[PDB]
């Protein structure tokens, strides 16, 4: 929460963190996206890569960062301390993400935050004990006629109940993987009650096209 | 055309727009897309330019600036630096999810418009911003990508023209305000999300000090059917200066929350009615709808009846078309408490440069957080909207005129809510 | 910069003593505290002649206009790209 650095001894310049080889080549795949001279424009990627490696951003993946790319540090730690996904403090393996603005808080997600929070005994910024779930709650996170919905670290939770939320926790705790879709009765978006428009076959190529083309 | 609204499915643009077709190539191509890319290409940055202007396209990101007249500005000789199409593909906007489906489920026509976009202002490659939270679309969109280039559609010898183009996709990390162009600009670069200063404009200096064009999502895929369609059949439908078809997402209080292409000056109950199956509880059970996402200020029910969902009749209805995102309110809804979560959404998602927005916004949320409680007086409520007309254009970007215009809005539509509301938190608790 | 418009004129700072009993600055200059106020320069010197006192003349420095760009915080070649805004 805090957006100052306190040197602790499991984060500090002397933690131990580099890149695996495979990242390195990720890295090589990263930095040749951007023109010559203008390196430091691959510090957002790169330093997301260095928060997929670990989980989390000590400050030596910061460090590392300006390292390779031969940036200040200070403008990898605006870039740490700016954007809300760089996870500075140690998450747990689920990072449960629920959207309550207004959108999803019309739709009752208040519903869904109380019961991940009584389904785990925690509550929002807090991580069980055991490491696995963090939960907090985040802004708008593009479902909203899904709404309301989860996020759980590459994955949307969408159209949830409460009992939908919970048979999620349950097949998270048991180690499987669950399936990133609406848990209601429709596919990604569509109308609920049935598909309203495009149900007419798509005529595909060459039609309608203007002459002298 | 008189009347507005009942599409057929034969003019949609984003066909596949549910998933139930084949979002590959395989798939693409078989509803029309990359078809006649290299005859839209060889006829020249004028033509495209032509068929653009006069299709009277205007910006779909949520400003309604003319696309032709926008993509125009790019037509003008180099200087040694490289030229840029850079799609604006964050969508933070509460309301607002049609892009997501752009990208998850067509992403081919999200490509073939960069193609022709860069053909059409000289732009040496493709930089699509992707939102951090979008990392399966921004996979999706990669795979597609993948599929353009290994058919020899992009990259060297885009579709067999003579000419070379590429397309990137940068993911973002997490921040509404770097949806706005600028602001998108400073985050490709390796910055904090901080929007420029205009002028200069992103046509003079945009990514990394080059000629750049930032576009939207759904301004950038409809482009290739405007190229091919023809521009009078997309100036056919919507008003005259409100021209085409748009994405509307209809979400909060309705029965089925659901994105949905529609012609442009369609009107908001027969939207909400068909599409939606009608406000939960019925359209007498209606009582508000922010008629294009958080940053246009709502309508009452009085206004939803006759009102038409384009940009022009909703600024006469002094509010906003933006990203065309219908959220419905309905009778059971606190909406002081909705609007004040709103608020908090505009000050967790600020990025602090400037003083009124860095300021202010946390004051209006503040405000707003003893308005929904009441624990103010009325003479707090006039006070509160000269703070957002202190707001609302001495800004950088239009995220403080998006976080004043709420603020507006409600005021202006139930400010005697307001008022009964602080009336009885005094007398309940004195 | 409204303290650099009008031209004044001082007198060089004699001795400052501590007071011996309460520490205070003591002085003997009755002049130490005259500043006076002129609107151009050649008034100062012709006061200055009119009076006797010998007089010495510092020019008005002004600042040179600067060449601001905005845009040149965001080159292409250049070295003023900004590193952060
Ligand atoms: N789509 C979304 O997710 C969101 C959309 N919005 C909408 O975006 C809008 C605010 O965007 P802004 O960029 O601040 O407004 P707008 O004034 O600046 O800009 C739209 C386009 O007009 C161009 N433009 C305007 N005047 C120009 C000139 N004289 N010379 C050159 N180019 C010129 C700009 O380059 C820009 O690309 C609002 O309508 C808001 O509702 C807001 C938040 C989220
Ligand atoms: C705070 C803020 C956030 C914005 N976010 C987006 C966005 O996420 N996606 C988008 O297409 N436009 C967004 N815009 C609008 C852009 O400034 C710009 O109008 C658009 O990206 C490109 O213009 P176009 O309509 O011609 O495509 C945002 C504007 C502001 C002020
Ligand atoms: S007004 Fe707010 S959103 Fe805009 S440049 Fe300033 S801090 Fe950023
Ligand atoms: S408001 Fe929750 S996803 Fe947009």
Redesign the interface.
């Known amino acids: 929460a805090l957006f100052v650095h306190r040197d602790t001894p499991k984060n500090n310049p002397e933690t131990p963190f580099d890149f695996t080889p495979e990242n390195y080549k990720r890295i090589e795949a990263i930095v040749k996206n951007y023109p010559e001279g203008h390196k430091a424009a691959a510090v957002l990627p790169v330093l997301d890569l260095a928060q997929r490696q670990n989980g989390w951003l000590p400050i030596s993946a910061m460090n590392k960062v300006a390292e390779i790319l031969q940036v200040p540090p200070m403008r990898v730690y605006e870039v740490a301390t700016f954007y809300t996904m760089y996870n500075r403090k140690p998450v747990g393996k689920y990072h449960i993400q629920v959207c309550t603005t207004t959108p999803c808080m019309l739709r009752n997600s208040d519903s869904i935050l109380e019961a991940i929070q009584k389904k785990l005994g925690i509550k929002v910024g807090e991580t069980t004990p055991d490491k696995l779930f963090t939960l907090i709650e985040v802004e708008c996170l593009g479902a909203c006629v899904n709404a309301p919905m989860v996020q759980i670290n590459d994955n949307y939770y969408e159209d949830l109940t409460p009992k939908d939320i919970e048979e999620i926790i349950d097949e998270l705790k048991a180690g499987k993987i669950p399936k990133p879709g609406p848990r209601s009765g429709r596919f990604s978006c569509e109308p609920a009650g049935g598909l309203t428009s495009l149900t007419e076959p798509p005529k595909g190529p060459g039609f309608g096209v203007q002459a002298g083309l | 055309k008189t009347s507005f609204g009942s599409?057929?499915?034969?003019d949609?643009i984003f066909?596949?727009?549910?998933?139930?077709?084949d979002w590959r190539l395989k798939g693409a191509?078989?509803?029309?897309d990359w078809?006649?890319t290299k005859?839209?290409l060889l006829?020249g940055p004028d033509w495209i330019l032509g068929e653009v202007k006069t299709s009277g396209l205007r910006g779909r990101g949520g400003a309604g600036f003319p696309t032709g007249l926008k993509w125009s500005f790019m037509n003008k000789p180099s200087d040694?630096?490289?030229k840029y199409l850079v799609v604006n593909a964050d969508?933070?906007?509460?309301?607002?999810?049609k892009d997501?489906?752009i990208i998850?489920?067509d992403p081919h026509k999200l490509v073939e418009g960069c193609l022709v976009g860069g053909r059409a202002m000289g732009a040496r490659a493709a930089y699509i911003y992707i939102?951090?939270?979008?990392?399966?679309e921004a996979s999706n969109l990669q795979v597609a990508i993948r599929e353009a280039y290994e058919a020899g559609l992009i990259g060297k010898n885009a579709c067999g023209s003579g000419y070379d183009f590429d397309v990137?996709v940068?993911?973002?990390?997490?921040?509404?305000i770097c949806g706005e162009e600028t602001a998108l600009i400073?985050?490709?670069?390796?910055?904090?999300?901080?929007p420029?200063?205009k002028?200069?404009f992103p046509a003079?200096?945009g990514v990394?000090?080059?000629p750049t064009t930032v576009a939207n999502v759904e301004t950038v895929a409809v482009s290739p059917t405007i190229?091919?369609?023809?521009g009078a059949?997309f100036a056919s439908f919507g008003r005259e200066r409100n021209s085409g078809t748009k994405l509307f997402?209809?979400?909060?209080?309705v029965?089925?929350?659901?994105?949905?292409?529609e012609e442009m000056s369609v009107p908001l109950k027969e939207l909400i009615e068909?599409?939606?199956?009608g406000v939960t509880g019925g359209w007498d059970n209606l009582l508000a709808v922010?008629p294009g996402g958080?940053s246009t200020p709502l309508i009452p029910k009085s206004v939803c009846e006759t009102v038409l969902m384009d940009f022009d009749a909703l600024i006469q209805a002094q509010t906003g078309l933006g990203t065309a995102?219908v959220?419905v309110?309905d009778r059971s809804?606190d909406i002081v408490?909705?609007?004040a979560?709103?608020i908090e959404?505009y000050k967790?998602?600020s990025?602090g440069?400037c003083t009124p927005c860095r300021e202010g916004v946390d004051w209006m949320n503040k405000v707003m957080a003893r308005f929904v409680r009441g624990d103010a007086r009325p003479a707090e409520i006039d006070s509160l909207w000269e703070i957002s007309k202190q707001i609302e254009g001495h800004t950088i970007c239009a995220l403080g005129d998006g976080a004043a215009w709420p603020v507006q809005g409600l005021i202006r539509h139930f400010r005697p809510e307001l008022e009964e509301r602080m009336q009885r938190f005094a007398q309940q608790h004195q | 910069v409204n303290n650099t418009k009008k031209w004044k004129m001082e007198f060089d700072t004699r001795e400052r003593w501590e007071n011996p009993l309460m520490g205070w600055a003591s002085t003997a200059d009755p002049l130490s505290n005259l500043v006076l106020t002129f609107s151009t320069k050649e008034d100062a010197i012709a006061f200055a002649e009119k009076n006797g006192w010998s007089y010495d003349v510092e020019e008005r420095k002004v600042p040179k206009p600067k060449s601001k760009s905005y845009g040149a915080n965001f080159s292409w070649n250049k070295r003023t790209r900004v590193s952060t805004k």
């Open positions: 599409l057929k499915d034969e949609r066909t596949n727009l549910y998933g139930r077709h191509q078989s509803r029309g078809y006649k005859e839209i006829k040694g630096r490289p969508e933070g906007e509460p309301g607002t999810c997501r489906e998850r489920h939102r951090g939270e979008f990392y399966n990137f940068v993911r973002g990390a997490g921040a509404y400073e985050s490709i670069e390796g910055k904090q999300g901080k420029r200063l002028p200069p003079d200096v990394f000090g080059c190229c091919r369609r023809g059949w997402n209809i979400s909060g209080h029965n089925n929350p659901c994105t949905v292409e068909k599409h939606a199956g922010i958080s995102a959220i309110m809804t408490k909705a609007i979560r709103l959404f967790h998602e990025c440069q």
